[PDB]
Symmetry: C4
């Protein structure tokens, strides 16, 4: 049966570890894909890890990072959560160098973008069958979430960006039913910048927390109903969630220009005026990870926080991170449980290898005892191929 | 339930990318079969990639291409679409050095031809159980589609050739129910030459577009009803569909003798007087691929065209290509969707290796926005074993 | 539903190739078990390949044939027919250095013998659960079929041997329901010798064709009803079915002493006074394979034959061979279809390697066009490990 | 449906071999995890082998045993019984360096403990969904069974220890329904020491046989009803069950201090005043294994016994061992069948390698004929990586 999506988020005091795949450790000898963007999404039966690959395995010559991000070889694929991304346990999903995926309760929806930078096409599959497409409307690198879309009552929702990572781009929200786009709207957001949105349902509404690559070191957000009537803003907290970023001062409800260029895929959970912020430990590099609870960090600008839980050690490698949810139809709970994944990037540019790949850890929000720690990748680099 | 097969082909203005397995890139380290003829066919539940193997893996000594094409080691096998053809994810189908496969809605039908050059036997399996055999009637390399067969109303249909690739041969159309041959007819086609037919259903009828290895650089066709009452011809378009071929001149509704010797497996879709032609970019070798819409190419002789969409770049390796359809019982559409696959041949004879294998890309016909590009194999040759 | 087993064997004029796994060819690089005794058995849903392994893979040091046949490491395992015996696609069945398996229509029965030579225990599993055991009654290498047992109307049947391979041993027939032995009888067979019986159902009765290791170069048989009331004899045909054997003279309805010592696992199909004999092409070594039809070879002693079909070339490697059937509950036929498998042994003692393993080919009996040929192993020995 | 758990243990006169995975032998070439604690547990449909991994494979550099036992990389995973623990056939369960698992009849319950030594958290999953957490209450290495938990009437039960392995610690019994902790009680057991409990159901009650790492060379026990009303004691038999241990003298119903320091995970089955003791053959190291029936060993102090059955030879490697049961809902029997597994440890500290891993053999209790033998690991050490 289709997901209702009408209950609020679960109250969450801590994050319990849910999975760890040890991809790069195992891939040293085993046949494991070189991957990026290991996002998680759940059906009413299971939870899956989606990822992007150049069609190359670790410790092989083809893992040579000479190929561009947006290449003809890049594919979206999925494996069971906690298992390694192997050609022997992965479903092929779509040919894509930018992707999104979500289950409406009946079938899997996957959004795969491929093609040239000046005319990329996003191909929509529902139950493995192509059901719709969209072409680039600004002819400048059509790109999407790199994490799960959000589904409420048989409609799934996503956000796409067309334009520069450098300045003003064009941002669109989409409403999708059974793989077919039934409504879309462009966001009136001058001076804002949206990339790689983490989106989730909450009381029949979707909230996305994204990445400003232009001039924001805090995170932009967009929230909308099913008719795509939206509000936009930035996370006001002085606890800045992007990377790179400055040290924590008083925040802003607009874009924080200080160290605002570049960014990393991220997420955050809104609870009234409060926010659960997932971010790196390092302000300048992709090192460490921590969950921080600010009871007024959504609308307030002060840099005060009450709860902080360690996820990845300051000296260890992290990277991309995204939100994912588990619905009452899967858990049997009365609310929608918030969860998150972290990509643990190893190799270039930070380390002396010829390749780059990411590990995967994930955590679920629970209202019971938890603990801070460090769950890093664990691979000993460089590898045999280097 | 049985596939009805009584609706028209879907109107198609473009081709969206459906799959890419990157199998040769992955097969550098991974345990992937050395394959040829990666044809796709679909059940009402899934789509599968069938292929032929010498029973050898990439980067192994057994992949040494000294063994003849019609060896006793050759086997037909299948794997899920977009995944690598590996011994760990492949389903064994039949012992064959020539094959065809299709799903009637209830069960899989596979046709595997093996045996000596002068007395080959086609073994027919319905649901993996041997249900019939056909013996070579002209004692000269009995051979079939290397592509999916077509099914209508609980009957599946195929074309088989017995005789030389050098001149006049014998061609038979077959009607199959539950894996049993219920009716066959020999085609009365002097001066014609049919090999490796790409066949598809359309309004309760089957259309095959084949390969003239004798004296034709345009593609021969045959079409028939359920009682096997047939018509024959060639594609009249000046846009020549075979390889090798001459440059585009005024076409012919018979065989075009210019560079008509030899060829490559191919396909085309008929829409009234018009034709969707898929072909290589080079006229001499198997390089590049493109889709061309000629509104008057089926029956008209001129070499004008409306639409052209790139698939594989001019300097990139292509090879075999074939058609497959998706029935409304799979898609929920009102028509039968045309799709196609391309084999991307790497190694001998063109490249300095000891082996030869094909990669896989597939596309499906949509009436929404698409884009031309190049989706090539991508493996760095030679390999360790070379 | 449970197999009736009450119809007669299918009339068979020829043998169509059913499978070929190319194990040793693929195992050169891939992770494939070193195997012996690749027998086939079928459930109403599928057909499976069972095999014995020392728990070692090809091209690995552990494949060193220093270990004895009846060791603690030997396990019975099964993989889908035509697929390679890999740790990634094989079900574990039982710890055994001698085995049998059959499906009664409801669940799998497996018989696994392990333990010391002077007190071996056969463990009976039904649906993976241990349901019964038998201990060695003569304390001399308790051993069984090395091929499928036979099931008629919810009772499965097998034959076990306890005693010397050198002279008179003890032979017992068993009746098994839901994995539990409900009746057994000892065979009153002085001067006879039974090892490695190939057994099949036929009109509610079981016929086994076995291997005389003592002093018979023709094959002994035993046939019985469901109450285990049995008849015994030898195949009278001058076309001798064992290996080693003499050249074809006039036969005997008793044991043929000439070249009677040693033997090979084999099979034969009784049709009234006639017999389908499967045997090697070489009289002294395990080379080649052929099917021979003698219209009076069961009860008559003359060495005349009307039909002969080549399976494996005279210069190629063969080995063990067994019978298997497909019931009307699987095929939809009115009779029980006879089929057979051949093990293609490579390595020691015949070849200069450190190991020994077998390939697998199988054939089904059909009443339509067939052909003789040679489908050999195909591996290039010696391997890297040697 | 829920497992009733209200019948008695089956009467058992011997142990028949159930499985052997030969994983270290296969892992020489194959891609097999370096594992510890290969405990077995059964659903009403299948039996599975759970295990812990550092996320490393055999013959890889990552298998370097310098990483601590309670690392962040440690994960609980499962595979079908008798198959190798491979990344290609293993199901991810939880992130854990200490674990327990059981099936209540409806769904799998897994318990995975991870986190820092001073604040470990037990994460409970029902059907793969986090349902509860328990935090370390004594802040000293919270740890559990390393063996299956026991389920009765839709409730599952486990034992957890918090405190030193050096002296007095804290021990708690837990009652779990649908993955939620409904009741727990602390054991009032001064002078006692419980670790790594092997627990099983019997007539609506649970009996655990554990490891005294403090000052006991005989095994401690605890037993309780559904309300967790418990009894405690030690196994009085002079046949000592732990390792290290002294030679068999007069026993004690309290802790036997002689060689009582340290130990190994083990199990035993209670039958009234009698006990089935599984133990190592050596008294100093982890070598050999045997089953012993002492008709008065549970409550009596003498060191006499009736039955003894060999499992692993005196000079062969053994290690951890634990109990698992098969309920009547799986077997169709009238009682609850006792079974057990043995871990076969190869490598450090005993052997000159860089790694440590365990093999797996399992046995089930039958009332029919059995035989003593030796079923050892069998791998030739050292390996290429050593
Ligand atoms: C990865 O790719 C790079 C770029 O193609 C390779 O760099 C080459 O290194 C050799 C050194 O002998 C030079 O001769 C080439 O000219 C380099 N190429 C370029 C474009 O500068 C590198 O060898 C590759 N690494 C692999 C395959 O492991
Ligand atoms: C194609 O054939 C299908 C199935 O044979 C037709 O659907 C049937 O149409 C008849 C006509 O009244 C109905 O009685 C049945 O209820 C239909 N069956 C199903 C399964 O739908 C369909 O009409 C045909 N379409 C055409 C002719 O275009
Ligand atoms: C592939 O097979 C061919 C032919 O069997 C091998 O070529 C041989 O190479 C030798 C020199 O090493 C030459 O004398 C001949 O041309 C070939 N021999 C024969 C008997 O034809 C080639 O070595 C093989 N490649 C492999 C196994 O990697
Ligand atoms: C297979 O096993 C045999 C027997 O153990 C090994 O033979 C040994 O060969 C070496 C040669 O240096 C001798 O030193 C040993 O004494 C031999 N053993 C015996 C019992 O004679 C052989 O090396 C093994 N092959 C492998 C592991 O590949
Ligand atoms: C063990 O418990 C089972 C299930 O609770 C008992 O079986 C039930 O017994 C009651 C008693 O009349 C019947 O009403 C039900 O029909 C039974 N249910 C099932 C599923 O069989 C069983 O009696 C108990 N066995 C004992 C007490 O030894
Ligand atoms: C396993 O890990 C250990 C410790 O990290 C490695 O041992 C090192 O070896 C060097 C000499 O090569 C010695 O100086 C030290 O004893 C160790 N170094 C450190 C920093 O502790 C060992 O090489 C590793 N084995 C592998 C990777 O195979
Ligand atoms: C959520 O939706 C379901 C189905 O529409 C409804 O039954 C339920 O009352 C809703 N829950 C709310 C509004 O809390
Ligand atoms: C929920 O689903 C029903 C069923 O289609 C739909 O009609 C209704 O609009 C929905 N309610 C929402 C979206 O709140
Ligand atoms: C075989 O058995 C079935 C069920 O017992 C019966 O219906 C059928 O008549 C039998 N076939 C024969 C005797 O030919
Ligand atoms: C076939 O099965 C029935 C059902 O159990 C049995 O009663 C009868 O004896 C059988 N008939 C045979 C074995 O011919
Ligand atoms: C074919 O479909 C069924 C199967 O034979 C038959 O009943 C029906 O009349 C036929 N329909 C056609 C030929 O369109
Ligand atoms: C436990 O089983 C069910 C579940 O609570 C309950 O109805 C029944 O009364 C109980 N039976 C016992 C404790 O034996
Ligand atoms: Ca930024
Ligand atoms: Ca041609
Ligand atoms: Ca003999
Ligand atoms: Ca102790």
């Amino acid at each position: 049966v289709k997901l209702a999506g009408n209950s609020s988020l679960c109250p969450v005091s801590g994050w319990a570890i849910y999975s760890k795949d040890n991809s790069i450790r195992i891939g040293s000898k085993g046949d494991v894909f070189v991957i990026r963007e290991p996002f998680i999404s759940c059906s009413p039966l299971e939870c899956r890890t989606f990822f992007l690959t150049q069609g190359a395995l670790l410790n092989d010559k083809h893992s040579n990072g000479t190929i561009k991000d947006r290449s003809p070889y890049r594919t979206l694929m999925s494996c069971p959560i906690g298992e390694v991304p192997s050609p022997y346990n992965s479903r092929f999903e779509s040919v894509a160098w930018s992707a999104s995926a979500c289950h409406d309760g009946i079938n899997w929806l996957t959004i795969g973008i491929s093609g040239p930078d000046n005319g990329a096409v996003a191909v929509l599959k529902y139950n493995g069958i192509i059901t719709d497409t969209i072409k680039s409307w600004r002819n400048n690198r059509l790109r999407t979430q790199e994490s799960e879309c959000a589904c409420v009552n048989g409609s799934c929702f996503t956000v796409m960006t067309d334009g520069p990572s450098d300045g003003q781009a064009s941002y669109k929200i989409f409403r999708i039913e059974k793989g077919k786009i039934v409504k879309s709207v462009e966001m009136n957001a001058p001076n804002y910048h949206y990339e790689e949105c983490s989106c989730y349902p909450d009381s029949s509404e979707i909230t996305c927390v994204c990445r400003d690559n232009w001039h924001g070191s805090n995170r932009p957000w967009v929230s909308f109903n099913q008719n795509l009537e939206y509000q936009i803003g930035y996370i006001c907290s002085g606890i800045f969630g992007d990377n790179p970023r400055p040290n924590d001062k008083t925040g802003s409800c607009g874009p924080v220009s200080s160290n605002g260029a570049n960014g990393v895929k991220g997420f955050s959970f809104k609870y009234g005026n409060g926010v659960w912020i997932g971010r790196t430990k390092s302000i300048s590099s992709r090192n460490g990870f921590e969950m921080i609870w600010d009871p007024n960090g959504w609308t307030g600008t002060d840099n005060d926080f009450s709860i902080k839980q360690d996820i990845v050690g300051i000296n260890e490698w992290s990277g991309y991170s995204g939100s994912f949810v588990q619905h009452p139809e899967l858990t049997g709970l009365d609310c929608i449980r918030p969860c998150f994944w972290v990509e643990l990037i190893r190799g270039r540019p930070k380390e002396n290898t010829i390749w780059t790949s990411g590990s995967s850890i994930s955590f679920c929000g629970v209202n019971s005892d938890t603990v801070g720690w460090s769950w890093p990748d664990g691979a000993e680099l460089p590898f045999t191929i280097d």
